[PDB]
Amino acid sequence: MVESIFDALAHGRPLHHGYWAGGYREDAGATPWSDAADQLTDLFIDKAALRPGAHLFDLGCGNGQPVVRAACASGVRVTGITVNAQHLAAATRLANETGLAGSLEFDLVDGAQLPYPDGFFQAAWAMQSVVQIVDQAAAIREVHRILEPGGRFVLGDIITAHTLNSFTALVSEAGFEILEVTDLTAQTRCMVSWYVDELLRKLDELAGVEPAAVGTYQQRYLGDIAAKHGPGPAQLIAAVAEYRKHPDYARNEESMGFMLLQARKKQ
Ligand X SMILES: Nc1ncnc2c1ncn2[C@@H]1O[C@H](CSCC[C@H](N)C(=O)O)[C@@H](O)[C@H]1O
Annotated binding residues for S-adenosyl-L-homocysteine, as ranges? 15-16, 62, 82-84, 110-111
Rule CB under 6 A: say whether 63 interacts with ligand X: yes
Rule CB under 6 A: say whether 111 interacts with ligand X: yes
CB of 132 or CB of 165, closer to ligand X: 132
Which range of residues in 57-65, 141-149, 158-166, 221-229 is near ligand X by CB under 6 A? 57-65
Size of the site for ligand X (CB under 6 A): 21
CB of 155 or CB of 199, closer to ligand X: 155
CB of 120 or CB of 217, closer to ligand X: 120
Q: Considering only CA atoms, which of 13, 149, 127 is closest in space to residue 81?
A: 127
Rule CB under 6 A: say whether 188 interacts with ligand X: no
Least distance to ligand X, CB of residue 135, Å: 8
Rule CB under 6 A: say whether 84 interacts with ligand X: yes
CB of 60 or CB of 151, closer to ligand X: 60
- DSSP H/E element including 27: helix 24-27
CB of 1 or CB of 212, closer to ligand X: 1
Rule CB under 6 A: say whether 79 interacts with ligand X: no
Least distance to ligand X, CB of residue 82, Å: 4
HSE of 197, CA atoms in CB hemisphere, 13 A: 18
CB of 217 or CB of 232, closer to ligand X: 232
- Determine if residue 12 is left, alpha or beta; phi over 0 gives left, psi from -120 to 50 gives alpha, anything else beta: left
Interface residue with ligand X, options 9, 14, 158, 187 (CB under 6 A): 14
Please state the residue numbers annotated as binding site: 15-16, 62, 82-84, 110-111
Q: Considering only CA atoms, which of 173, 174, 171, 142 is closest in space to residue 155?
A: 171
- Determine if residue 175 is left, alpha or beta; phi over 0 gives left, psi from -120 to 50 gives alpha, anything else beta: left
Query: In the chain, where do the E strands start and end?
Result: 18-19, 55-60, 77-82, 105-108, 121-127, 147-159, 177-183, 188-189, 257-264
Interface residue with ligand X, options 110, 148, 183, 198 (CB under 6 A): 110
Please state, in angstroms and rounded to a whole number, the distance separating the CA atoms of residues 234 and 241. 11
Which range of residues in 27-35, 47-55, 121-129, 177-185 is near ligand X by CB under 6 A? 121-129
Interface residue with ligand X, options 60, 151, 156, 233 (CB under 6 A): 60
Give the total residue count for the chain.
267
Q: Are 130 and 154 in contact (CB under 8 A)?
A: no
Give every CB contact of residue 89 below 8 A, 6+ residues apart in sequence: none
Binding to ligand X, residues 127-186 (CB under 6 A)? 127-129, 132-133
Q: Considering only CA atoms, which of 180, 116, 123 is closest in space to residue 151?
A: 123
Rule CB under 6 A: say whether 47 interacts with ligand X: no
Give the single-character DSSP code of 56.
E
Residues that bind ligand X (CB under 6 A): 14-16, 60-63, 65-66, 81-84, 87, 110-111, 127-129, 132-133
